[PDB]
């Protein structure tokens, strides 16, 4: 369904902006 997936996509996108903004608050990052 076009709308439900567009809502999902957008929630995914919004979750990511929150997360990347919270990175300036990190003390350590583990990397591959």
């Amino acid at each position: 369904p076009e709308v439900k997936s567009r809502i999902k996509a957008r929630m995914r996108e919004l979750a990511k902006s929150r997360m990347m903004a919270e990175v300036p608050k990190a003390t350590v990052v583990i990397t591959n």
Partner: protein, 85 residues
């Protein structure tokens, strides 16, 4: 190349353990590294761990007691190096 990252926030008085503030694959991972390097937040290459840590936890929630073993070792290395200057 393949890309992954796990960002952690940890204060010694307030947090009993490290909070996962971000996790990332591909350009997301790269973004976390970049902002962090941008903030002079340390960045540690530990692939077997980063791999083992990713599916395990989630954003905003403190790591499992199980991980206290390898994470604390890292926070330690990070802080030993930063002491001299």
């Amino acid at each position: 190349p393949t890309h992954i990252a796990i960002a952690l926030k940890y204060n010694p008085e307030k947090d009993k353990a490290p909070v996962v503030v971000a996790k990332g694959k591909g350009t997301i991972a790269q973004k976390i590294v970049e902002i962090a390097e941008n903030y002079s937040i340390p960045v540690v290459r530990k692939p077997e761990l980063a791999r083992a840590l990713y599916p395990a936890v989630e954003v905003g929630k403190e790591i499992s007691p199980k991980f206290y073993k390898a994470v604390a070792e890292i926070i330690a290395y990070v802080m030993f190096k930063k002491k001299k200057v």
